[PDB]
Symmetry: D2
Amino acid sequence: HMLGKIALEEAFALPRFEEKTRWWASLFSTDAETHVKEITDINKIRIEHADKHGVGYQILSYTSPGVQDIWDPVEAQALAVEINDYIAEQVRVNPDRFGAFATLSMHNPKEAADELRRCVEKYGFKGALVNDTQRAGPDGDDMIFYDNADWDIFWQTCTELDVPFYMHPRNPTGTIYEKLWADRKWLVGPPLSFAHGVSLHVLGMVTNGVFDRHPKLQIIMGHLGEHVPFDMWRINHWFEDRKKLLGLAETCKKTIRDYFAENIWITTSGHFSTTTLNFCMAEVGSDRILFSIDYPFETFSDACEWFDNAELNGTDRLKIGRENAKKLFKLDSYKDSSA
Amino acid sequence: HMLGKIALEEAFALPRFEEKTRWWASLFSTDAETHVKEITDINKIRIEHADKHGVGYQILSYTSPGVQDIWDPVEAQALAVEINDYIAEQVRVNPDRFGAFATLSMHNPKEAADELRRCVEKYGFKGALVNDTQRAGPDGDDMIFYDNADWDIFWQTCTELDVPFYMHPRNPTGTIYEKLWADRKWLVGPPLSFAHGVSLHVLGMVTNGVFDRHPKLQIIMGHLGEHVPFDMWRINHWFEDRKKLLGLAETCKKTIRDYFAENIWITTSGHFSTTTLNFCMAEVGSDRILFSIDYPFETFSDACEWFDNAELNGTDRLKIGRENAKKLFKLDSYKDSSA
Amino acid sequence: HMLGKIALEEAFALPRFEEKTRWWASLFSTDAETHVKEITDINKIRIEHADKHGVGYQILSYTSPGVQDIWDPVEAQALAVEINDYIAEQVRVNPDRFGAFATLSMHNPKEAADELRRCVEKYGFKGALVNDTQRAGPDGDDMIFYDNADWDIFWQTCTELDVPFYMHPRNPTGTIYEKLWADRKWLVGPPLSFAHGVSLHVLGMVTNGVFDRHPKLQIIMGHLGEHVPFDMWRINHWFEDRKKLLGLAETCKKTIRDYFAENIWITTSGHFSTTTLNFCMAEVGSDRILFSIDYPFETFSDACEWFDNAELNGTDRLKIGRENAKKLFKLDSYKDSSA
Amino acid sequence: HMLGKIALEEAFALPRFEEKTRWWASLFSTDAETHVKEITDINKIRIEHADKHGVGYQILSYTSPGVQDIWDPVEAQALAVEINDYIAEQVRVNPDRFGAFATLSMHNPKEAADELRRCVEKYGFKGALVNDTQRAGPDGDDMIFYDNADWDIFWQTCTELDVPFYMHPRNPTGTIYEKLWADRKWLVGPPLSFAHGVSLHVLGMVTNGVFDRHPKLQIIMGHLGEHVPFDMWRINHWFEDRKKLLGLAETCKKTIRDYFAENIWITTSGHFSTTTLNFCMAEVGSDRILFSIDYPFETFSDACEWFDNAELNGTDRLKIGRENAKKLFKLDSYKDSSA
Ligand SMILES: [Mg+2]
Ligand SMILES: [Mg+2]
Ligand SMILES: [Mg+2]
Ligand SMILES: [Mg+2]
């Protein structure tokens, strides 16, 4: 089985947030004590897992909801900077095993662009990972989406640095939580709510022309694309045969399949299904699919024993396991990168 | 090609609602004049389409948002009764070509159960079709969901009559529309918002124990299951391996795959994709998949030329085209029912 | 996991043929001593495997090449009678776990029909399993095929008794072996030669009208159909669009898809691929697919751990695992038959 | 819709072989007069079809059985030289639309190697296309296979020139025809016999170590791989878990999946099935699949309207339609090569 795999939806948390970490674990972990140790650890447990399961390189990112949960913009910016400085220091212990995505406050486009630039230019971070919309407003009940002209300066910064942006989910909050989710709360997270948020935001970027103004922008979705490949036919039909005759073409110049060929990537995080992977290879193409785990919400063992033992042609196993990410992130050599 | 097909997501509108019909058409039709004529027509244009394309029998239902848009419970109930009386007269003209689903006000469980009972016992309707949540509250900004114990009397009526309930989508309205959809409005409807509503409601029924209290209950989703089959693996994993260790097992006794084998059906309405159909046959099983069109939002030609010519084994073409629905709806003979 | 599974490509050998068993094992086993014990054991080792792996019922058959390797018709007939008497006594130990297929000499249609009748009427055997063509001629270099009018009396007996016929492979021999296989001998058996023989014979039955004269006849192929589902499109095209315009229609009245819907079954024996299973469900239909193992050439563990853990909807897992065979073979209760 | 497609299983015949052409047409064409005109035409009808259906570039090859039907080696060699000189002259008329594969007598490895070299060095031919084994012996009843060390000089010539070898089928002849096919003659050709021959030959090359001695060698199969992808799991299992423990590893050093990633290509010729293409994308990988037609045995319309309209992600449509072939055959510029 395959050595030198790359995973890039792999979360950490600051040690000082044990209470928040235990809260998130109460929703999404069956072993909270192990979860606290694993999500705070960078350089021991994570390496032991990766050595056992053929993972050469991991791009680390901050746990959800992370900075997007913080609606005080001053507090949010300070936390992002703290997190980026912290993980940059941590990955220096084992730089041949780890990279990092930038953690950002997304209250303000220029501020986020400047901090992403700092992360990339100063620390060699590989892109940004953001947990869907930024909570905003007096009690955090507002949502900042990034699919509009105010964010052009930010998306042009991604394309100038040529680094991708990973749109990770976050939990529903406030008014949205109360109206839709509170009475069916077991659906919060991976079962449904996570994908509803991310697919809304990315298809918002599609239909509001973000990839037309920034066609080099690379956007990554985890969880095999948050339902979007299932409706590729249906979205394409209702765009090209319906809404684009009614006004959508004014802000959306290409097909949904064009944007998946040129701009959008999907990851295998938390979706260890060969049948669904095969369907995504049909609807999206193996060139656009990246291995990932969703650790420590998922185990290395679940993800890697699935992928290593999945029935897959050798060409696509290599691409999805590491070679797609090697090219996308312009990776230097790392442990087992050519094994 | 295949004769005697059954379609059952096929909408009509009352002639007296032309203004509302034209509004809905301005969002979802590219030929509004034909749409207006086709959605009100039952027994001429609709028959001509079905004769050209091998559709023997259609179960008709009221257009979306229909009665679920009406937040005055007295007006809503009167409209539902009016619609059911109206369509019973229309389908009496060609009983070998048409059946009907009940149209319901869902403000009150017992009231809805009594009108469903009247439709089945008086008119021989085949079940109910409801456009997601019932608008309620002073300005219609509240939502009535049916995934709780207050609706036990209604679901027990469905199982006592042994008729299915079709959970059809409706548009986002009010605060939900303003917060999530207004800034990305081209995603309203088939592109995304429709599936988000229906999947939320049906998975709410799953996780709140509706199919445990009412194990005979049959629920149908259009559009190949509103994303749910894509995440069957992911939902199953996050139910059985995560949330069911945290409390979900107290209100959810079977697996998501169990509920799709025993309670839930999907339809091909508006999703004319053989690649996606094949994937749904893996994840749901051809026994649980029904042909449908979504007329007049989709054309007979699009739906029927796809299905009649799709590469499919002969066994499943027959089941999905008509034999599954013949059994589910206990259909007597109809035009070309054994052709 | 699933209990009460049925397997029906499960071989035994007579104890007195140890030399032949060891020769066949030298080609197709990596542990010949265990293979010899397992292929000769009926009522102990097989039960231990079946108890561990959720197999309720096994229909046993004689090992390849079996009687089809015997070109002396007197010797062949006596061996078939001997084998059938033997296994009837053996399966008698555990009728709640075992049935049997008839073993036949196929030198003479009437003789084969009479022995099949004896097996069904005297012993309650479930059908016939035959290893492709019957060796005949001076050195056994001739081949007897069954896709012609001389065999009408035999196929009419199958439909009168209403039992299926399993077309199992055998090794290439004589002139064919020397010319095609000796210089690439590692392809003999499962890698290639087995499927070439069975597909030739069954498609011979198709194109020579066997299923037109005997429309109730049920034919089973192992190994997910011996390549035939892969070319369902290509065969259908070259039948309906080419050869049926050149003369094939005179002896072949239905499409290849008709014959797979009405006459032909495939088995999962020795082909534990969910990806290939999904493709066969598209091309053949889950109603026409039966679980089987190919023991002791395959292990219970490989077949059952694959099938029990494969990603599959619950409807088709139940059908393929046991319910298709329960109906096809008109099975009374057996261990875990309704578990 | 897609322009600039490349097809490379596209046959021509010499005008002086009209009688042979009409015999072959009597087996495989329903319109012999059009077939005769189309198979002999190079620069008018073939261009008109390609202009209508978005085919920018075609690599032409000699009809089957071609030179492999000629068992006199002097006559065979003279015919190969004649064919290669002829087509080189014909394709100079439209060099932006046509290339050619070498036609070879395969009686002698050095002779075939020298004529292949002449074709590539003198005429810029793109590789070789050979119709399975070379008929040999006094009345042509012997078969020359190429999967042995005597052919090392030929395969080394292929890798030194860095051009692929297309293993095309031919009809069964002589004793093999009489014993296997004469009594089920409608299966000769595309329905079954063609794939049996090619898969035997290519898997012979695999198991006799040709790709271990010549790891750069590229071998192409038409018709979506002549059944081999269907059994990728089964072949791999019976190699790695069985025959490679018995001696096969001594002459076969990699897995069947390795050889499909490094040495073997498949084509869509005569197999216009999206369901089967998707399955082949899973089992072989879209990087290893090339569009082709099988003209004039198949029509441009069937092949191109299937492919142009098949549900496919944009990445793989571009690769399979032309970009895979552009890279493999180093086709920098031709008509619509960048449309
Ligand atoms: Mg995550
Ligand atoms: Mg509808
Ligand atoms: Mg067997
Ligand atoms: Mg050809």
